[PDB]
Design a protein around this ligand. Structure first.
Ligand SMILES: CCCCCCCCCCCCCCCCCC(=O)OC[C@H](COP(=O)([O-])OCC(O)COP(=O)([O-])OC[C@@H](COC(=O)CCCCCCCCCCCCCCCCC)OC(=O)CCCCCCCCCCCCCCCCC)OC(=O)CCCCCCCCCCCCCCCCC
Ligand SMILES: COC1=C(OC)C(=O)C(C/C=C(\C)CC/C=C(\C)CC/C=C(\C)CC/C=C(/C)CC/C=C(\C)CC/C=C(\C)CC/C=C(\C)CC/C=C(/C)CCC=C(C)C)=C(C)C1=O
Ligand SMILES: CCCCCCCCCCCCCCCCCC(=O)OC[C@H](COP(=O)([O-])OCC[N+](C)(C)C)OC(=O)CCCCCCCCCCCCCCCCC
Ligand SMILES: CCCCCCCCCCCCCCCCCC(=O)OC[C@H](COP(=O)([O-])OCC[N+](C)(C)C)OC(=O)CCCCCCCCCCCCCCCCC
Ligand SMILES: CCCCCCCCCCCCCCCCCC(=O)OC[C@H](COP(=O)(O)OCCN)OC(=O)CCCCCCCCCCCCCCCCC
Ligand SMILES: CCCCCCCCCCCCCCCCCC(=O)OC[C@H](COP(=O)(O)OCCN)OC(=O)CCCCCCCCCCCCCCCCC
Ligand SMILES: CCCCCCCCCCCCCCCCCC(=O)OC[C@H](COP(=O)(O)OCCN)OC(=O)CCCCCCCCCCCCCCCCC
Ligand SMILES: COC1=C(OC)C(=O)C(CC=C(C)C)=C(C)C1=O
Ligand code: SF4
Ligand code: SF4
Ligand code: SF4
Lengths: 155, 172, 67, 317, 80, 385, 98, 96, 49
């Protein structure tokens, strides 16, 4: 019936978004390096849909790797604000998830989340590359559960 | 010792123009990439074939428990006095047995740096840093571990921790 | 190994011959079993039109000489 | 049944292009020792439907563009032309027969430049305007080398009809008479797609190019029109230089062999992306203005003589 | 002069060819046994119809019939 | 002219840079790089942290070279204490220091290429880098910021299988270098993009304090591993790869040679590593062994005090420079008698190099600047500190 | 006609795909996103003075079959040459140089 | 040469548990590589070990259709594997 | 392990011997669980040292 049709159709909508996430890393990190190793031959990220990364306008997920210092904090917000609406943020690192080896310093944002909402927090100083891959896969499980069409029908 | 790195008869002149005009030298690169599509990719099937690690791999913390069942942590404060990220708060009491144990223990896993300065300082092998690295979270609160998300955590991996401790104890 | 890039080409290898075989049989079926005559210069058209005049309204139809 | 032809002419190129997005991700992968998509379908056969059905659902944000009129006419111009340069393509049987066919393909190809100009100008940005001006310079500069290669070659088949190139090749490939033309043609087909060792525009490391401010649909189309004439300018090389078999009977063999060589020339561009550092904008030009254009003009003069002194003036028609 | 061409063939190995074929094509027509035919093979094509002239009896050559031994007979274009 | 602020997020360089540029048409009139986008306060925080609990600040200064950054500090703290690491530890630091130079160079050569547009060299080498990480993970426990080269030695002995596995990697790595070698060294496209770009004259390089491959690329003879030897490098034989025509290419060629020369040094270290212990064992400086602290009181007291309070290095100040893969990495550690330092000025090969960008990239277009940053191997952790 | 139908269909497909693009989706400063290239202009009119060059060179396909073949050859060569000498002057002028 | 690989490929496909078995692997695990089952596991996971493949693919798990309230057929998880077999799959220890 | 033709494809195209230097670890790798080790440890007055 109508309920079944809109459950199946967002299952389609969700499959398309999670299958192909094009992510743009914020670099600025020791975490970025690890991210690179996820793009590399050992744990190809492309195989999962993620791409070797594209620009801000065409990016579905932003991975903030590395300390978001006070001077870079305005820039992260504008790039987050310059992305298409279906848009998510994965915070890699224990220096973007809060503070870090560098936590209490005059120039360090205590969590990139403060600047922009964060969907999955990957923990680890250099979150092991597999970790990030688990975190990206966890975003894909979060994207599967979302039911935007059902909520509009149940409006 | 030092080494220099970058330092005409028609035979040579024609050879130069045979490598500039009928490009023959960008071809030694095209065959070079053709040599790799026919090799075996290094990619591992990720979720099913997780990559290789070592018994030394430092990940999610956990509080080991004596085989009897007695927490090993005796609230020394020898592990926040060294934790450089200033992440641990272990307020303690006499536990009403007369014994000496924590009422409080903490890591803020969004401040920790997985340096293992807490597993090598602990004179009792209570706090370790397990081989987890799939513990990402959708929220900030699930990373501020308490003594009960570290003790039942250590009530989980103890079959998998002790093998690695017993495997590396001599080298440590 | 590299075995797998083939599934992909296989579709771009039929997705590209569907057009060449298609255009070349929707011509031989919408032109009476004969290639679509090509009118490049005035004289070809005339002959083509003449044919239509000779038989049916269709160029394709042909009069063997019994007509 | 003419409409049956378009439906069987545009579906089998938008469904092919889609799997060039895939094939441009796997072949590049195995060179990088990394498997491409394997998961969404059996071997990535079902990945383009995902980001097709995904990009179109992302907000087509008109970002304070100067003029939507352009922002939404540029991306459509492109896919409009690119999917049109296929209409006169000379298969054993072309969708439409067009004397002046090769001119048609040349002219329409040119209009594309506008997409770059319009898109860059509308979307207000330094990068956008910068990239566009620089990009079209390239595109235009390479038209002048394409035309001559195109012209020169003509003296040999002796007409502007794509459909005759097949006959001219009834017994030999034109690659052997003109491999110099075919070299510079390859670069003028590989760099007029803003593609390959030559991707100055959309400079990604240096420039973030024009399509930068584009997303979701408006982007998809621009993209769809870069992979639907990545197959043209190889499909022409499989007509103008590499001549497959043509028999009055068995009219498929041509299409089949057309396949076999268009995929290589479409798979030959893929070795390039994964092999050459990008040319710098100055060098690209100096490649055409001071190296290719000279050789192209002289060889054009050579080909106007070859018929006369070999008395081989081709037959009109 | 002759050894200046040797570096210009090693470096700059393009303009050499472009000024070696620019010209080659100017001398091949003037020196070829077969350049005469291009203005002749192109002169034989009867694109428009050959209007016949009225007979007076004063014209011996004009071949009366398409198959007379007379007239422009091209046993040349054949096996040119 | 036109002030296009190169992207702080821009994929090029290391993504922590601004580089406001004046665009005189296509060419760039002037560059004013605005670094500071990653100044975490490393030097301020170290003053509040004990000498052991500050080592970690160092592997996170140039995250591409992990264990060489540490080797500086470790050398600096050792000199202040007048203690020297045991013989096996010194070879292990040279073994790990050369693995880091290979990994920094694989980082610098391959990332320079993707900026230029060559994408495959990065993928082939990065798989070779994951093999090398595994060596750090299998000796320290982390694939990065290992914190293994501590004051007095390494923290723990090499696992029983590491040296065989390092031989197998070094045995086959050389083919991987020239595979990149054939891909980029002779290509028309790479030589044109790299040759005669950012030429720096010899005296200008010394005056601008370049001190690295940037110094050697212009032909100046200085390595700091053969000029002022540290550890046991005085016992290993290698050839500095100096170059002429100081241009990006000559600098690239030098970086590819040092990877090859490092395989020669790694070869000697595996062939000649001595039996011994890995940390000086005066318990006042390096912590007592796990069995000893659990059976002898003097060791428990020494473990408790060292972990809780610290080494308490004697008052003094030292500037110790080691040849980090980027260039001379030096720590000016000023020390009061206290267990925690007073000042730690991290000289970053990179603060000097980025200053040179405006002089080196003059009369150059926008695209050349992407190559100019690439050939300085600048990672902003060291510059920003 | 057929050509009309095709080119028109080709447009409708393009438009639909942007129609669906702006409607299927169904603030935040999301929208927020120079000197003269004299060199460029030069390159541009260099191309204009050369594109017209082609326009005078396209007759070759139908002039090769002229009776005065010798004349065509001569007329063409001069064009191609005088245009090459122009380019050459530019070269010396360094106009071609970027 | 080419003769042998196709014979080996058809073997794997048919002996990976049957057609539905194939589909459930090919379409849930993207793997058809036959491998010695080191051991089944509570929750129904399956561990396999082919030493002839390279160092990343000689140890792979094949998860359960479902476990507890997880419904982990399509939702395969990295942490689903028990603590007992993490020591082996990540190859910290050869000991099964 | 690859069909000889395919691998000779990679040796000829690369120009270098390629069976010898593998980027993939098959038996090259040391197996894990190395036997346990025993690490090596008068007038030793600290005032002298
Ligand atoms: C030509 C195509 C050759 C494809 C091929 O099998 O290459 C083998 C071989 C390269 O593979 P390899 O290095 O031996 O690796 C063997 C595998 O590791 C181990 O091989 P395996 O025995 O595990 O797998 C054999 C394979 C079955 O064999 C195939 O892979 C397909 C063979 C097609 C031959 C035509 O099993 C499969 O079913 C998986 C096929 C994956 C690709 C999808 C099937 C093709 C779909 C096309 C339509 C869509 O190439 C040759 O022997 C010469 C090929 C002819 C000259 C080029
Ligand atoms: C560096 O520049 C590039 C990118 O931007 C950064 C990319 O993202 C990418 C990656 C992009 C892709 C995988 C493709 C993007 C999306 C597509 C598949 C476009 C194709 C979409 C379609 C609608 C095809 C289906 C066709 C039909 C209309 C059906 C016909 C019946 C590449 C390769 C790239 O070159
Ligand atoms: C255009 C065609 C779109 C087809 C989508 C479904 C087929 C693709 C697929 O493999 O989906 C797998 C998924 C299930 O697999 P999954 O993606 O949840 O996880 C499978 C295991 N891994 C993680 C390895 C991929 O099936 C769907 O949920 C499809 C939902 C969209 C279609 C719904 C009906 C309409
Ligand atoms: C096969 C490959 C090519 C495929 C091309 C076609 C792919 C699409 C297939 C059909 C998809 C149909 C649904 C598309 C998305 C519909 C909009 C939507 O999901 O909700 C967002 C919209 C808008 O999102 P919103 O209202 O939450 O606002 C988001 C925040 N701002 C304002 C910033 C954008 O939600 C709705 O208003 C209700 C939509 C109901 C749609 C009908 C059900
Ligand atoms: C005597 C008989 C009568 C007369 C006969 C005619 C006279 C003889 C003709 C000889 C012709 C020799 C070849 C000339 C055409 C080749 C193009 C060319 O001329 O080279 C230009 C350029 C050279 O580069 P560079 O080294 O920088 O030289 C300029 C230095 N300032 O080259 C380049 O750098 C371009 C590089 C672009 C990227 C290329 C990437 C590789 C492409 C591989 C393509 C593979 C497929 C090619 C075939 C496709 C067929 C359809
Ligand atoms: C009629 C001609 C038809 C075809 C015309 C084609 C265009 C002609 C352009 C002539 C250019 C003259 C010129 O000014 O060249 C300058 C050139 C150096 O200029 P440039 O290329 O900018 O150098 C930068 C290198 N990075 O330096 C040079 O001049 C190099 C010139 C080398 C060739 C000179 C002529 C050689 C002729 C050889 C004929 C055969 C000999 C055997
Ligand atoms: C908003 C999005 C953007 C919108 C614009 C997008 C771009 C639109 C243009 C796309 C490219 C079109 C290129 C057309 C070039 C001219 C084609 C041509 O001249 O050939 C027509 C042909 C000429 O006759 P001939 O060559 O002799 O034919 C062979 C048999 N004798 O035979 C004919 O004369 C056929 C009849 C004339 C057809 C000419 C082309 C018509 C194009 C119409 C477009 C609008 C469709 C209807 C509305
Ligand atoms: C130059 O090589 C690189 C890319 O390709 C152009 C990337 O996309 C990315 C990822 C892109 C973004 C915006 C994080 C990185 C990090 C990179 O180094
Ligand atoms: S988190 Fe640890 S690793 Fe990631 S950046 Fe901050 S410090 Fe470097
Ligand atoms: S964990 Fe080990 S160190 Fe930290 S308090 Fe408990 S016992 Fe003392
Ligand atoms: S690991 Fe380092 S940081 Fe994390 S808790 Fe133990 S000591 Fe503090």
């Amino acid at each position: 019936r109508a309920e079944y049709v809109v459950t199946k159709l967002d299952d389609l909508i969700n499959w398309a978004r999670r299958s192909s996430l094009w992510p743009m890393t914020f670099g600025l990190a020791c975490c970025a390096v690890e991210m690179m190793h996820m793009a590399a031959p050992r744990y190809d990220m492309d195989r999962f849909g993620v791409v070797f990364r594209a620009s801000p306008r065409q990016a579905d997920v932003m991975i903030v790797a590395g300390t978001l210092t006070n001077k870079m904090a305005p820039a992260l917000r504008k790039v987050y604000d310059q992305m298409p609406e279906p848009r998510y943020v994965v915070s890699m690192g224990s220096c973007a998830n809060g503070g870090g080896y560098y936590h209490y310093s005059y120039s360090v944002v205590r969590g990139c989340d403060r600047i922009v909402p964060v969907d999955i927090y990957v923990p680890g100083c250099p979150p092991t590359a597999e970790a990030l891959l688990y975190g990206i896969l966890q975003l894909q499980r979060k994207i599967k559960r979302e039911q935007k069409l059902k909520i509009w029908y149940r409006r | 010792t030092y080494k220099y790195v970058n330092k005409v008869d028609m035979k040579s002149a024609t050879d130069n123009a045979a490598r500039i005009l009928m490009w023959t030298e960008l071809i030694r690169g095209l065959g070079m990439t053709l040599s790799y599509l026919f090799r075996e990719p290094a990619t591992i099937n990720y979720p099913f074939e997780k990559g290789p690690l070592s018994p030394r791999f430092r990940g999610e913390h956990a509080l080991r428990r004596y085989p009897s069942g007695e927490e090993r942590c005796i609230a020394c404060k020898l592990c926040e006095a060294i934790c450089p990220a200033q992440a641990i708060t272990i307020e303690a009491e006499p536990r009403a047995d007369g014994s000496r144990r924590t009422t409080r223990y903490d890591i803020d896993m969004t401040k920790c740096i997985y340096c293992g300065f807490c597993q090598e300082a602990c004179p009792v092998d209570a706090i370790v840093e397990g081989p987890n690295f799939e513990f990402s979270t959708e929220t900030h609160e699930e990373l501020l571990y308490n003594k009960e998300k570290l003790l039942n955590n250590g009530d989980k991996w103890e079959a998998e921790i002790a093998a690695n401790i017993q495997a590396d104890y001599l080298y440590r | 190994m590299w075995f797998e890039i083939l599934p992909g080409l296989a579709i771009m290898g039929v997705c590209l011959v569907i057009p060449g075989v298609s255009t070349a049989y929707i011509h031989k079926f919408t032109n009476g079993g004969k290639e679509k005559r090509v009118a490049r210069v005035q004289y070809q058209w005339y002959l083509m039109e003449r044919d239509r005049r000779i038989s049916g309204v269709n160029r394709y139809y042909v009069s063997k000489g019994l007509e | 049944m003419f409409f049956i032809n378009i439906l069987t002419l545009l579906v089998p190129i938008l469904i092919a292009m889609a799997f060039l997005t895939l094939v441009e991700r796997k072949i590049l992968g195995y060179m990088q020792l990394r498997k491409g998509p394997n998961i969404v379908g059996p071997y990535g056969i079902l990945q383009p439907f995902a980001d097709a059905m995904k990009l179109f659902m992302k907000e087509p944000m008109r970002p304070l563009t100067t003029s939507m009129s352009l922002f939404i006419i540029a991306p459509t111009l492109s896919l409009t032309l690119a999917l049109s340069l296929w209409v006169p393509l000379p298969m054993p049987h072309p969708l439409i027969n067009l004397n002046l066919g090769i001119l048609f393909i040349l002219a329409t190809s040119s209009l594309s430049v506008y997409s770059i100009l319009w898109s860059g100008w509308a979307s207000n940005s330094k990068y956008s305007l910068f990239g566009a001006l620089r990009a079209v310079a390239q595109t235009i500069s390479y038209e002048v080398t394409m035309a001559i290669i195109l012209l020169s070659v003509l003296l040999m088949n002796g007409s502007y009809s794509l459909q005759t190139l097949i006959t001219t090749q009834e017994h030999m490939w034109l690659l052997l008479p003109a491999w110099p033309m075919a070299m510079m043609w390859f670069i003028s087909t590989l760099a007029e797609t803003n593609r390959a060792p030559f991707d100055l525009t959309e400079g990604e490391s240096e420039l973030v190019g024009f399509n930068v401010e584009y997303a979701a649909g408006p982007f998809a189309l621009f993209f769809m029109a870069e992979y639907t004439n990545i197959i043209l300018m190889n499909a022409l090389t499989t007509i103008i230089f590499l001549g497959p078999l043509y028999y009055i009977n068995l009219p498929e063999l041509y299409s089949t062999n057309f396949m076999m060589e268009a995929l290589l020339l479409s798979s030959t561009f893929l070795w390039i992306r994964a092999s050459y550092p990008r040319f710098r904008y100055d060098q690209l030009m100096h490649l055409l203005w001071k190296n290719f254009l000279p050789l192209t003009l002289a060889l054009c003069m050579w080909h106007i003589s070859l018929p006369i002194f070999t008395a081989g003036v081709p037959p009109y028609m | 002069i002759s050894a200046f061409l040797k570096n210009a063939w090693a470096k700059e190995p393009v303009l050499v060819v472009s000024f070696s074929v620019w010209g080659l094509a100017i001398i091949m027509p003037m020196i070829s046994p077969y350049t005469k035919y291009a203005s002749m093979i192109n002169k034989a094509t009867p694109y428009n119809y050959p209007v016949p002239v009225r007979d007076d009896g004063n014209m011996p050559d004009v071949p009366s019939h398409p198959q007379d031994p007379l007239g422009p007979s091209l046993d040349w274009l054949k096996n040119l | 002219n036109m002030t296009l602020n190169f992207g702080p997020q821009h994929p090029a360089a290391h993504g922590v840079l601004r580089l406001v540029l004046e665009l005189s048409g296509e060419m760039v009139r002037k560059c004013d790089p605005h670094i500071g986008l990653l100044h975490r306060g490393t030097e301020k925080l170290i003053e509040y942290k004990t000498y052991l609990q500050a080592l970690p600040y160092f592997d996170r200064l140039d995250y591409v070279s992990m264990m060489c950054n540490e080797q500086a500090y470790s050398i600096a703290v050792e000199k202040l204490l007048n203690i020297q690491p045991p013989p096996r530890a010194q070879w292990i630091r040279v073994l790990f220091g050369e693995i880091t130079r290979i990994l920094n160079h694989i980082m610098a050569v391959t990332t320079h290429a993707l900026d230029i547009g060559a994408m495959t060299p990065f993928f082939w080498m990065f798989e070779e880098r994951e093999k090398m990480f595994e060596f750090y993970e299998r000796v320290s426990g982390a694939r990065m910021h290992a914190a293994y080269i501590r004051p007095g030695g390494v923290h723990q002995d090499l696992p029983l299988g590491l040296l065989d596995d390092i031989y197998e990697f070094s045995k086959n790595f050389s083919l991987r270098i020239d595979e990149v070698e054939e891909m980029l060294t002779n290509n028309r496209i790479w030589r044109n993009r790299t040759v005669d770009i950012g030429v720096v004259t010899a005296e200008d390089a010394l005056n601008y304090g370049f001190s690295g491959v940037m110094l050697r690329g212009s032909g100046i003879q200085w390595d700091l591993r053969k000029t002022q030897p540290y550890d046991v490098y005085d016992q290993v034989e290698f050839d500095v790869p100096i170059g002429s025509r100081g241009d990006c290419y000559d600098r690239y060629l030098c970086r590819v040679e040092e990877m090859r020369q490092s395989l020669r040094i790694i070869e000697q270290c595996l062939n000649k590593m001595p039996p011994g212990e890995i940390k000086v064992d005066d318990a006042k400086v390096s912590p007592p062994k796990r069995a000893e602290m659990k059976t002898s009181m003097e060791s428990l007291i020494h473990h408790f005090k060292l972990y809780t309070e610290g080494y308490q290095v004697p008052p003094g100040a030292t500037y110790t420079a080691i040849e980090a893969p980027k260039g001379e990495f030096g720590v000016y550690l000023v020390s009061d008698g206290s267990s925690r330092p007073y000042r730690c000025k991290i000289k970053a090969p990179g603060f000097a190099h980025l200053a040179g960008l405006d002089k080196m990239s003059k009369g150059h277009m926008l695209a050349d600047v992407v190559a100019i940053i690439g050939t300085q191997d600048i990672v902003f952790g060291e510059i920003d500190r | 006609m057929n050509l009309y139908t095709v080119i028109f269909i080709n447009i409708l497909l393009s438009l639909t795909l942007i129609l669906v693009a702006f409607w299927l989706p169904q603030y935040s400063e999301k929208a927020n996103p120079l000197p003269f290239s004299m060199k460029f202009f030069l390159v541009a009119i260099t191309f204009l003075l050369f594109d017209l060059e082609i326009a005078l060179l396209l007759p070759l396909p139908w002039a090769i079959q002229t009776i005065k073949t010798s004349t065509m050859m001569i007329m063409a060569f001069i064009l191609v040459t005088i245009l090459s000498l122009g380019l050459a002057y530019e070269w010396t002028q360094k106009g071609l140089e970027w | 040469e080419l003769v042998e690989v196709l014979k080996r490929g058809v073997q794997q496909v048919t002996g990976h548990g049957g057609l539905r078995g194939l589909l459930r692997v090919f379409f849930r695990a993207n793997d058809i590589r036959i491998g010695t089952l080191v051991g089944e596991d509570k929750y129904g996971n399956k561990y396999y070990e082919d030493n002839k493949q390279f160092f990343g693919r000689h140890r792979w798990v094949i998860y359960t259709t479902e476990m507890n309230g997880k419904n982990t057929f399509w939702d395969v998880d990295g942490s689903m594997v028990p603590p007992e077999w993490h020591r082996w799959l990540h190859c910290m220890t050869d000991d099964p | 392990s690859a069909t000889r033709v395919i691998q000779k494809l990679r040796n000829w195209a690369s120009g270098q011997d390629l069976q010898a230097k593998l980027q993939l670890r098959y038996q090259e790798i040391a197996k894990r669980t190395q036997p346990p080790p025993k690490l090596p440890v008068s007038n030793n007055y600290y005032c002298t040292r």
